[PDB]
Amino acid sequence: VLENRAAQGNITAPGGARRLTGDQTAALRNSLSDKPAKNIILLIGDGMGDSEITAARNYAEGAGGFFKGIDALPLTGQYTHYALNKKTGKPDYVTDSAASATAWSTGVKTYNGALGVDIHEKDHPTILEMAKAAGLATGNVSTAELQDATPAALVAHVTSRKCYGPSATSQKCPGNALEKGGKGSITEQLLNARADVTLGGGAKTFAETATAGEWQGKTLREEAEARGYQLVSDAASLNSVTEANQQKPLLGLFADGNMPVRWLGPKATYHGNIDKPAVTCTPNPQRNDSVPTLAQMTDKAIELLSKNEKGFFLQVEGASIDKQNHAANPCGQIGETVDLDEAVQRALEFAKKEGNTLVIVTADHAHASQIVAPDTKAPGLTQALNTKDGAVMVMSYGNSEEDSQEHTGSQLRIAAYGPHAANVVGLTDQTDLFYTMKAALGLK
Amino acid sequence: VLENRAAQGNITAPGGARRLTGDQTAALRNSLSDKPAKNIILLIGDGMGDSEITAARNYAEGAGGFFKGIDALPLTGQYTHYALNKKTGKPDYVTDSAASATAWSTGVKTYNGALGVDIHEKDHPTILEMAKAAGLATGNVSTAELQDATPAALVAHVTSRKCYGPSATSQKCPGNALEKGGKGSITEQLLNARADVTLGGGAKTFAETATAGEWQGKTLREEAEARGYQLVSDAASLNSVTEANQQKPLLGLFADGNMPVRWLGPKATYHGNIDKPAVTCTPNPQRNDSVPTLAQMTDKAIELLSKNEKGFFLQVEGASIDKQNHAANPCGQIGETVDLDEAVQRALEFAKKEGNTLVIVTADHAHASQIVAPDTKAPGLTQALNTKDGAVMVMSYGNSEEDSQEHTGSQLRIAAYGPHAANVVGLTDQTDLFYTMKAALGLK
Numbered sequence: 038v039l040e041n042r043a044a045q046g047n048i049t050a051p052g053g054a055r056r057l058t059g060d061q062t063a064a065l066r067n068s069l070s071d072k073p074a075k076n077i078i079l080l081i082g083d084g085m086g087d088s089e090i091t092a093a094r095n096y097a098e099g100a101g102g103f104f105k106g107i108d109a110l111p112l113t114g115q116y117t118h119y120a121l122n123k124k125t126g127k128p129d130y131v132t133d134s135a136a137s138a139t140a141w142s143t144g145v146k147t148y149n150g151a152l153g154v155d156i157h158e159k160d161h162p163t164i165l166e167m168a169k170a171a172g173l174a175t176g177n178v179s180t181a182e183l184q185d186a187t188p189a190a191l192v193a194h195v196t197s198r199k200c201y202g203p204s205a206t207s208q209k210c211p212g213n214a215l216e217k218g219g220k221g222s223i224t225e226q227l228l229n230a231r232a233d234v235t236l237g238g239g240a241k242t243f244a245e246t247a248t249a250g251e252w253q254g255k256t257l258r259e260e261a262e263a264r265g266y267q268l269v270s271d272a273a274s275l276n277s278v279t280e281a282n283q284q285k286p287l288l289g290l291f292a293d294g295n296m297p298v299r300w301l302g303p304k305a306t307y308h309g310n311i312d313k314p315a316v317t318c319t320p321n322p323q324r325n326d327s328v329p330t331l332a333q334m335t336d337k338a339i340e341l342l343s344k345n346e347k348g349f350f351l352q353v354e355g356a357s358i359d360k361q362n363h364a365a366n367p368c369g370q371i372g373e374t375v376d377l378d379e380a381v382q383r384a385l386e387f388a389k390k391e392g393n394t395l396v397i398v399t400a401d402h403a404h405a406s407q408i409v410a411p412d413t414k415a416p417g418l419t420q421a422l423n424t425k426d427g428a429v430m431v432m433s434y435g436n437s438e439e440d441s442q443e444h445t446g447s448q449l450r451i452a453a454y455g456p457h458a459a460n461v462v463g464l465t466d467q468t469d470l471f472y473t474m475k476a477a478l479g480l481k
Numbered sequence: 482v483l484e485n486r487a488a489q490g491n492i493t494a495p496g497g498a499r500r501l502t503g504d505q506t507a508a509l510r511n512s513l514s515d516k517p518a519k520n521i522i523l524l525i526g527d528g529m530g531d532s533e534i535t536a537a538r539n540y541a542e543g544a545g546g547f548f549k550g551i552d553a554l555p556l557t558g559q560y561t562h563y564a565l566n567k568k569t570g571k572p573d574y575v576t577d578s579a580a581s582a583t584a585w586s587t588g589v590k591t592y593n594g595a596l597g598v599d600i601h602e603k604d605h606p607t608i609l610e611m612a613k614a615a616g617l618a619t620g621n622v623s624t625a626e627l628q629d630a631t632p633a634a635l636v637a638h639v640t641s642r643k644c645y646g647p648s649a650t651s652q653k654c655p656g657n658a659l660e661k662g663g664k665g666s667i668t669e670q671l672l673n674a675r676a677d678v679t680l681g682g683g684a685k686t687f688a689e690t691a692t693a694g695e696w697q698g699k700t701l702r703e704e705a706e707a708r709g710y711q712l713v714s715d716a717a718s719l720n721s722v723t724e725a726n727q728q729k730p731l732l733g734l735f736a737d738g739n740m741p742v743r744w745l746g747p748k749a750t751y752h753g754n755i756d757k758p759a760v761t762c763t764p765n766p767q768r769n770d771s772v773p774t775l776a777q778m779t780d781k782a783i784e785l786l787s788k789n790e791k792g793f794f795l796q797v798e799g800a801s802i803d804k805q806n807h808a809a810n811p812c813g814q815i816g817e818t819v820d821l822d823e824a825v826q827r828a829l830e831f832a833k834k835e836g837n838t839l840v841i842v843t844a845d846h847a848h849a850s851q852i853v854a855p856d857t858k859a860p861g862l863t864q865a866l867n868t869k870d871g872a873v874m875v876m877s878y879g880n881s882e883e884d885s886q887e888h889t890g891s892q893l894r895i896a897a898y899g900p901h902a903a904n905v906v907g908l909t910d911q912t913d914l915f916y917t918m919k920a921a922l923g924l925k
């Protein structure tokens with residue numbers, strides 16, 4: 038169990054590239070605890086497989102460097118995230134964001150596109166719901182629309198991830214439609230779930246009006262306010278919040294859709310590593326200072342949530358690693374991984390200080406990006422990048438002839454720190470995570 | 482630290498896909514020992530990243546299944562394997578088989594193509610040479626030609642991995658050429674190294690005659706005989722060997738080049754998943770019954786090597802996983818992964834009984850193969866396969882327009898069992914592996 042895993046010295050010399058400063062046995066033995074966790078912070082890098090982590094480290098910290106957040110969790114393993122074919126019930130080797138999120142928040146596999154329901158379309162309780170029932174404080178933060186699959190899986194039970202608001206739900210999820218006697222759209226179910234802290238983008242869906250029930254005729258935003266929610270829309274106002282609980286829950290909407298990415302860089306192109314010059318990422322001119330970063334939202338949530346004496350459960354998502362991966366944009370993809378690392382550092386610092394906090398960092402599924410040789414002649418989209426090492430790294434996206442690059446089914450890294458973290462070691466399934474968090478919290 | 486990691490029941494039901502049957506904190510604790518290791522068995526799946534492991538498991542055991550050998554090692558982590566640019570000494574993000582093999586066997590990073598030498602072309606002792614010097618028995622087994630990079634790295638110190646025999650060395654490694662005062666070609670250095678057990682393919686090069694020294698004019702095969710080596714060339718003759726030591730060293734040459742692959746299947750093609758039907762692998766008909774499998778060679782090696790009271794170091798390589806990956810042949814690649822799992826099972830079975838044996842399973846670098854959705858329209862080479870689940874899995878090779886698919890730089894899985902296995906957990910470097918073995922054996 039080391040806090041520093043960077044290369045020891047001169048990487049060209051014997052022992053210079055080593056990351057271990059000594060024997061781990063004693064340290065690792067000391068980090069194994071089966072005492073219950075008071076809190077749980079689950080950080081999800083959407084589409085962040087081992088390849089994505091490696092590319093981001095190579096670029097930002099150098100090959101021999103190390104993410105002070107992402108790479109600092111002592112207990113590691115690899116987990117499977119295959120989904121299920123709805124019709125046959127047989128495995129579907131490459132999952133989407135909805136079925137995977139449903140797996141760790143519910144403990145049951147499902148079909149791609151499903152949120153909080155099994156292949157029979159039957160609802161199952163999420164870890165957030167259970168935590169809330171036990172009296173723990175709950176938080177849900179993401180850089181994507183709050184209706185997007187990852188954050189939505191914790192608070193909604195819908196047959197199609199496309200059922201954002203009333204208008205789409207009536208069409209695509211008629212059985213879940215409020216008018217038709219259902220629990221409602223994703224946004225309505227989010228409002229009903231009432232987590233203590235909810236922060237992200239997706240403000241545009243709150244402009245729709247409820248078609249039935251108590252708050253019928255009033256936009257979803259008006260209903261939020263009528264229900265006692267504190268709504269903040271920028272960094273300044275989030276900062277001014279001093280409490281969030283069942284009486285005054287916090288809801289932050291920092292963008293119409295997804296929050297802007299941190300870095301700017303060109304899109305990878307065919308033969309881009311050979312016909313285009315190497316690129317150096319730069320800050321995104323379109324992201325405003327008033328827009329809080331993932332680390333800021335994470336820190337604020339930990340502060341408000343930690344006021345609960347029974348404990349808290351918090352899920353944090355670095356959403357756009359996946360989205361920029363689909364877009365074949367190395368700079369956007371890497372910047373979103375660096376952003377997540379900052380949020381992980383905030384989580385770990387708190388966990389180390391508090392001492393009864395289980396911190397887990399993983400991804401919902403693997404993705405397209407691959408690190409290939411500089412002179413590679415590939416059929417897909419490529420791009421050469423100038424790294425922190427002063428060397429060129431080429432990234433490749435070669436699994437789709439369409440505009441969007443696709444997910445991949447490879448098992449990927451899961452890492453943890455704190456009480457019950459041993460349950461992440463070795464090979465496990467994404468559904469085991471649900472059970473690991475449920476038992477750690479004694480949420481049974 | 483469980484031995485069974487298969488899905489517990491109905492994967493469509495709540496908790497049915499779980500691989501864990503309980504808390505593993507206590508089990509993991511007991512798995513942690515820093516007592517000295519008497520023996521070390523290092524198994525390398527050439528080019529076997531997490532993607533390769535997942536694809537093969539999905540096909541052979543089903544998504545919810547598990548490799549009784551490969552997936553059964555309790556302590557897990559991810560390690561980096563970047564090489565170095567010979568000129569600049571800066572990292573080269575994608576290593577070849579020679580630079581990576583040199584890193585774990587020597588403890589120093591080097592340039593692509595180098596064996597046993599650093600970037601200054603200065604050689605360093607290998608873990609096998611250090612084991613011999615300490616009095617331990619040594620074994621080197623592989624399914625590739627014995628001159629190939631992975632097995633050769635343990636016994637040779639050459640500036641270019643292409644220096645197989647006398648002829649190639651004269652023009653590509655003149656400073657190593659015997660007639661120029663060098664230590665000799667890879668094969669001559671292997672003969673000089675005199676490991677107790679050396680099994681693999683590559684008989685072709687033993688047909689070359691030395692150009693200088695005490696055995697000039699004689700083929701390298703004659704030199705081996707002249708130096709006291711027991712030469713075996715099929716499974717029956719291998720089985721007859723009762724002892725292998727410094728006076729009676731064993732040299733098995735089971736093929737002219739690489740040993741034949743276990744499974745046959747067609748090569749992936751452009752739009753092969755949508756143009757051609759799903760394939761089902763079959764055993765390789767052209768594979769002679771008398772050619773030993775990797776598990777048979779591994780088993781026989783353990784038997785002979787364990788006669789040494791001081792202990793033994795054994796490296797086992799499933800070489801063709803990489804070669805079939807380069808060839809974009811899913812069935813060849815998967816079959817070679819299944820083949821390595823059998824060898825891992827023999828290693829683990831021995832280790833559990835013996836109790837002072839450190840077993841490590843990992844790869845030298847990542848590769849091209851990716852698991853994509855069935856309806857994927859990719860720019861590279863694809864193929865649909867019928868898995869054990871009766872479902873279709875599509876594999877993609879999309880990082881090269883040349884005849885050979887390429888390695889990738891992603892960090893990958895390293896797993897271990899036994900004394901000192903804890904040094905494999907968390908993020909480490911491929912060079913740390915050298916030190917982990919050196920310390921476990923007390924060779925320092």
Ligand SMILES: [Mg+2]
Nearest residue numbers: 083134187356
């Ligand atoms: Mg997401």
Ligand SMILES: [Mg+2]
Nearest residue numbers: 527578631800
């Ligand atoms: Mg090899």
Ligand SMILES: [Zn+2]
Nearest residue numbers: 083084134401
């Ligand atoms: Zn996703």
Ligand SMILES: [Zn+2]
Nearest residue numbers: 084359360363
């Ligand atoms: Zn995605």
Ligand SMILES: [Zn+2]
Nearest residue numbers: 527528578845
């Ligand atoms: Zn290799």
Ligand SMILES: [Zn+2]
Nearest residue numbers: 528578803888
């Ligand atoms: Zn290769």
